[PDB]
Design an enzyme around this catalytic site. Structure first.
Site, short mmCIF file in Angstrom:
data_model
loop_
_atom_site.label_atom_id
_atom_site.label_comp_id
_atom_site.label_asym_id
_atom_site.label_seq_id
_atom_site.Cartn_x
_atom_site.Cartn_y
_atom_site.Cartn_z
N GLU A 57 -5.02 4.35 -10.48
CA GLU A 57 -5.87 3.25 -10.41
C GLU A 57 -7.09 2.92 -11.29
OE1 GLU A 57 -6.04 1.73 -5.83
OE2 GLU A 57 -6.16 3.94 -5.79
N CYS B 91 0.84 -1.21 -0.04
CA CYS B 91 -0.01 0.15 0.25
C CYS B 91 0.76 1.37 0.10
CB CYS B 91 -0.71 0.02 1.17
SG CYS B 91 -1.96 1.52 1.21
N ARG C 114 0.00 4.59 2.95
CA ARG C 114 0.10 4.43 4.25
C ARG C 114 0.42 5.42 5.07
NH1 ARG C 114 3.88 -0.56 5.01
NH2 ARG C 114 4.22 -0.11 2.57
N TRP D 12 -9.28 6.73 -0.68
CA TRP D 12 -9.40 7.33 -1.80
C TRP D 12 -8.58 7.01 -2.76
CZ3 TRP D 12 -8.35 9.94 2.96
CH2 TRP D 12 -6.93 10.18 2.99
C1 HEM Z 1 -6.35 6.60 1.82
C2 HEM Z 1 -5.77 6.54 0.76
C3 HEM Z 1 -5.26 5.31 0.11
C4 HEM Z 1 -4.63 4.97 -1.12
C5 HEM Z 1 -4.15 6.22 -2.00
C6 HEM Z 1 -4.27 3.77 -1.37
C7 HEM Z 1 -3.39 3.20 -2.69
C8 HEM Z 1 -3.21 2.05 -2.87
C9 HEM Z 1 -2.62 1.28 -4.11
C10 HEM Z 1 -2.26 2.48 -5.29
C11 HEM Z 1 -2.51 0.01 -4.07
C12 HEM Z 1 -1.91 -0.76 -5.08
C13 HEM Z 1 -3.06 -1.73 -5.41
C14 HEM Z 1 -3.49 -1.46 -6.99
O1 HEM Z 1 -2.51 -1.23 -7.81
O2 HEM Z 1 -4.52 -1.61 -7.49
C15 HEM Z 1 -3.07 -0.31 -2.62
C16 HEM Z 1 -3.06 -1.53 -2.25
C17 HEM Z 1 -3.37 -1.86 -0.83
N1 HEM Z 1 -4.19 -1.02 0.29
FE1 HEM Z 1 -3.95 1.10 0.25
N2 HEM Z 1 -4.78 2.98 -0.32
C18 HEM Z 1 -5.30 3.86 0.70
C19 HEM Z 1 -5.88 3.48 1.76
C20 HEM Z 1 -5.89 2.26 2.41
C21 HEM Z 1 -6.64 1.66 3.62
C22 HEM Z 1 -7.53 2.59 4.46
C23 HEM Z 1 -6.30 0.60 3.59
C24 HEM Z 1 -6.69 -0.57 4.78
C25 HEM Z 1 -7.41 0.03 6.09
C26 HEM Z 1 -5.55 0.03 2.60
C27 HEM Z 1 -4.92 -1.43 2.19
C28 HEM Z 1 -4.47 -1.72 1.24
C29 HEM Z 1 -4.05 -3.13 1.01
C30 HEM Z 1 -4.18 -4.39 2.01
C31 HEM Z 1 -3.30 -3.11 -0.12
C32 HEM Z 1 -2.74 -4.41 -1.10
C33 HEM Z 1 -3.94 -5.25 -1.31
C34 HEM Z 1 -3.45 -6.47 -2.04
O3 HEM Z 1 -2.65 -7.04 -1.62
O4 HEM Z 1 -4.25 -7.13 -3.05
N3 HEM Z 1 -5.24 0.95 1.70
N4 HEM Z 1 -3.55 0.91 -1.92
C1 LIG Z 2 -5.00 -3.30 -10.23
N1 LIG Z 2 -5.17 -3.60 -8.70
C2 LIG Z 2 -5.41 -5.28 -9.16
C3 LIG Z 2 -5.66 -5.90 -7.55
C4 LIG Z 2 -5.48 -7.31 -7.33
C5 LIG Z 2 -6.06 -7.76 -6.09
C6 LIG Z 2 -6.45 -6.44 -5.04
C7 LIG Z 2 -6.38 -5.27 -5.50
C8 LIG Z 2 -6.91 -4.22 -4.45
C9 LIG Z 2 -5.83 -3.11 -4.02
C10 LIG Z 2 -6.36 -2.19 -3.24
C11 LIG Z 2 -6.89 -2.40 -1.93
C12 LIG Z 2 -7.12 -1.23 -1.25
C13 LIG Z 2 -7.34 0.01 -1.75
C14 LIG Z 2 -7.71 0.99 -0.98
C15 LIG Z 2 -8.40 0.72 0.43
C16 LIG Z 2 -7.78 2.15 -1.57
C17 LIG Z 2 -7.29 2.51 -2.66
N2 LIG Z 2 -6.99 3.93 -3.28
N3 LIG Z 2 -6.69 1.40 -3.62
C18 LIG Z 2 -6.80 0.24 -2.95
C19 LIG Z 2 -6.32 -0.79 -3.53
C20 LIG Z 2 -5.97 -4.95 -6.67
#
Ligand code: HEM
Ligand SMILES: CNCc1cccc(CCc2ccc3c(C)cc(N)nc3c2)c1
Ligand code: HEM
Ligand SMILES: CNCc1cccc(CCc2ccc3c(C)cc(N)nc3c2)c1
Ligand SMILES: C[C@H](O)[C@H](O)[C@H]1CNc2nc(N)[nH]c(=O)c2N1
Ligand SMILES: C[C@H](O)[C@H](O)[C@H]1CNc2nc(N)[nH]c(=O)c2N1
Ligand SMILES: [Zn+2]
Lengths: 407, 411
Positions: free
Chosen positions: A283, A106, A109, A278
């Site tokens: 994305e 993430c 964070r 958000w």
């Molecule tokens: C607040 C602004 C946030 C932004 C800008 C953000 C951004 C991102 C991005 C860009 C990814 C890459 C996934 C992708 O490319 O599709 C990601 C993954 C992830 N985010 Fe964040 N996120 C946010 C909030 C959160 C919150 C609130 C949580 C949990 C409480 C969280 C948990 C995770 C987890 C667990 C992943 C990896 C998921 C996986 O392994 O498939 N995120 N996030």
């Molecule tokens: C192109 N992705 C492929 C892929 C495959 C498996 C899981 C995911 C979810 C990643 C994920 C999880 C949580 C998020 C939150 C809370 C906010 C945010 N802005 N982005 C987020 C992205 C994505």
């Protein structure tokens, strides 16, 4: 054993010690690195509880106190007795914030400590889950001024009474396969879009139809619920230079809320724990609109820009990709919906790394997922060495419910 | 044990057995992944197994495993080892070895070309002047008037570690970098340290923005010497843009031949510390890294200004816009002058084909995703959603310390 990470663009060097407190495994061995692979009882439970309570009481500067020992004792008793235990609200909040804090993939964070945690462990039914989810959505959305949140449903018991949200995100568009061959709507959701119809959903068979919720409480059969439209904030996509852009008929939702992950705290398993933040601009614009196995609109845009799509060497795909992403950001910003660009998000994450190495001794990070899907090397994370390892509390993946649900 | 990789765009799943033949370490453990860390005197003792493993590989490829040719060579190498503490490679073995080091280069997206490597055997070379001659012939042959040809030149192997051949330059052809008193840099900031050494060694620096650095050559563990590549051998390409006419006025140009000269080639336990090798450029190497990295020529802002982009907030994506135009120009310039270059879409596509073919005919293809994915437009290239396994096979190209850090100065 006390590892160093170098930023090659700034020569800055951080020392990692946090990795020594790592528990879970990575997938890699000394012979083979799996860094690019998407997914590699009463006795089990008490050490898990202990590890957590130990870090919790350490975090509040009462390590080795009466309270600490008393709580360790109390939980130890409840485990022996009930073969599980319950988190105090404080521990639960600490744990959820920390699962986010430890999400090595993430980029967002830096916000981790400001998470709003809704305790839904008193929920008993799908209708109950619907209510909690609606409330989460409305709070998180906040009329476009988005706030991070997570809602936590009861923990797994004997795995036959699991709460699950069957959707992958609370808010996603439907995908239906066409007789003509191709796909209407969102291809990633074709199978789910069908299980909805296969359970009773009346699809408008449109392109951007908000999917219904499919909610499983206490292991029962899942139920369909439609999120009130007034609760689903959407953004029409226009380009600030190309007026033909709007005629592509593109829109996206403002709230990214992932709902299919498992939250693990002190050995306890929360199989329903939808969480939201958000969007980063890319994305929606890069992965959602431009992936082949998705909306795949690159060709159409490039045509409308009248670019030479004959040879890949013109870089028309790249040129379009940029414009599309300019539009996304432009649309959200004009409509006052929170969104961050990949330059700002990555810059913030570098700062978060700085802070984490300083005040915690490190920050687990997965470069393959932290680097944005466009303009990688012109963002500061590209030249940033990262160490990837698994800390707990954590968010984990879990099988899709339909592959498991004993009907 | 069998390992699967999935491509998440096409659902194509492949199965790797090749990783079983893996020897060296990755740096990773079950508790930590170091997949994004850039970099994570040998006795008869450990040499014969290494020799044997190689010769086994070699004789299998030529389908003569266990032949009398095979056994006699093992005995021949063995005797030479306990008699002389090292051994010599036949030409056939050298060639096979060098192709395979390229083939095993997990960070290289251009490996589809691996079998078409022109190998120059420079093991009879004894002096720096001899080195200069060999390198000049390499540059001329490889450059081929713009129709580039992959080549490697191989100087004598290490013996006691005290008589090393080294090319001090990181690349045969590279531009000087000069730190100015005001802290600004003239030319390529990446080459400041090296530039200074050259000046110190007597190089008369013209102090321009694009000065080709001299060669600094070490033969047989002796002090290095300076030589000037003849200018007529150095093919350069002025950078213009197909639509923007002000672009030429930025005064940019780049050399045509990417030739890496600071790596160590390892074959059957033998170490070749001077082994300059070249192919041709993928556009983004020049356009994204060489021009737009903040630690490089960093012309992003100047290009953006001339395009009159909204440079007030990053969310205008002006940086992204200028990056694309700069890469458009690089490709356009090279193709116009008929100097071989490949765009990142073409190169990643070919790599996936290579990789798939390698899984079938070889049982795997070690690949470092962090390095294979291009530095712009990552996810719209087919390697991005391609799962990859990374592990280390020999023959291999390895890093080595910079010579100025280890060299014992004679005088
Ligand atoms: C607040 C602004 C946030 C932004 C800008 C953000 C951004 C991102 C991005 C860009 C990814 C890459 C996934 C992708 O490319 O599709 C990601 C993954 C992830 N985010 Fe964040 N996120 C946010 C909030 C959160 C919150 C609130 C949580 C949990 C409480 C969280 C948990 C995770 C987890 C667990 C992943 C990896 C998921 C996986 O392994 O498939 N995120 N996030
Ligand atoms: C192109 N992705 C492929 C892929 C495959 C498996 C899981 C995911 C979810 C990643 C994920 C999880 C949580 C998020 C939150 C809370 C906010 C945010 N802005 N982005 C987020 C992205 C994505
Ligand atoms: C023929 C055209 C070639 C192309 C288009 C190509 C492409 C590339 C690219 C883009 C990189 C990453 C460089 C970066 O972005 O920093 C790379 C790395 C590498 N290439 Fe190739 N290459 C070619 C030929 C060769 C040849 C002939 C060899 C050796 C005989 C070779 C061996 C390597 C090695 C060992 C690396 C990784 C170096 C490291 O780990 O630092 N390549 N290649
Ligand atoms: C800006 N990057 C940083 C960096 C850091 C360490 C090494 C390298 C060069 C990798 C390398 C080695 C050999 C190559 C050959 C033969 C051809 C080609 N087209 N590209 C090549 C790239 C680059
Ligand atoms: C195969 C590939 O490694 C995998 O799909 C990953 C690559 N890196 C990624 N990075 C982000 N941020 N999001 C993703 O979905 C992916 N996909
Ligand atoms: C820290 C980071 O892994 C390192 O700077 C790598 C990332 N990936 C790369 N990929 C390529 N092709 N070239 C590079 O120089 C780098 N640098
Ligand atoms: Zn690893």
């Amino acid at each position: 054993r006390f590892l160093k990470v170098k930023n090659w663009e700034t020569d800055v060097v951080l020392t990692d010690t946090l990795h020594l407190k790592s528990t879970l495994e990575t997938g890699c061995t000394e012979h083979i690195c799996m860094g690019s692979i998407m997914l590699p009882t009463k006795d089990q439970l008490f050490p898990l509880a202990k590890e957590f309570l130990d870090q919790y009481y350490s975090s509040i500067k009462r390590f080795g106190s009466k309270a600490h020992m008393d709580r360790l004792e109390e939980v130890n008793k409840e485990i022996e007795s009930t073969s599980t235990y319950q988190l105090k609200d404080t521990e639960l909040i600490y744990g959820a914030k920390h699962a986010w804090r430890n999400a090595s993939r993430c980029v967002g964070r830096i916000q981790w400590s400001k998470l709003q945690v809704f305790d839904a462990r008193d929920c008993t039914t799908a209708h109950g889950m619907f209510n909690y989810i609606c409330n989460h959505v409305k709070y998180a959305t906040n009329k476009g001024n988005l706030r991070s949140a997570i809602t936590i449903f009861p923990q797994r018991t004997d795995g036959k009474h699991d709460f699950r949200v069957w959707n992958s995100q609370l808010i996603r568009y439907a995908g239906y396969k066409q007789p003509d061959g191709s796909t209407l709507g969102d291809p990633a959701n074709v199978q789910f879009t069908e299980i909805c119809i296969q359970q009773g959903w009346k699809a408008p068979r449109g392109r951007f139809d908000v999917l219904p919720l499919l909610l499983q409480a206490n292991g029962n059969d899942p139920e369909l619920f439609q999120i009130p439209p007034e609760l689903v904030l959407e953004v029409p996509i226009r380009h600030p230079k190309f007026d033909w852009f709007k005629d592509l008929g593109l829109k996206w939702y403002g709230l990214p809320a992932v709902s299919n992950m498992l939250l693990e705290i002190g050995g306890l398993e929360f199989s329903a724990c939808p969480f939201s933040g958000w969007y980063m601009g890319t994305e929606i614009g890069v992965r959602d609109y431009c992936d082949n196995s998705r909306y795949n609109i690159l060709e159409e845009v490039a045509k409308k820009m009248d670019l030479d799509m004959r040879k890949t060497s013109s870089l028309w795909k790249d040129q379009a990709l940029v414009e599309i992403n300019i539009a996304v950001l432009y649309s959200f910003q004009s409509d006052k919906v929170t969104i961050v660009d990949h330059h700002s998000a990555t810059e913030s994450f570098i700062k978060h790394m700085e802070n984490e190495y300083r005040c915690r001794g490190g920050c687990p990070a997965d470069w393959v997922w932290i680097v944005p899907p466009m303009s990688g090397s012109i963002t500061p994370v590209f030249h940033q060495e990262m160490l990837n390892y698994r800390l707990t509390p954590s968010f984990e993946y879990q099988p899709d419910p339909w592959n498991t649900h004993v009907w």
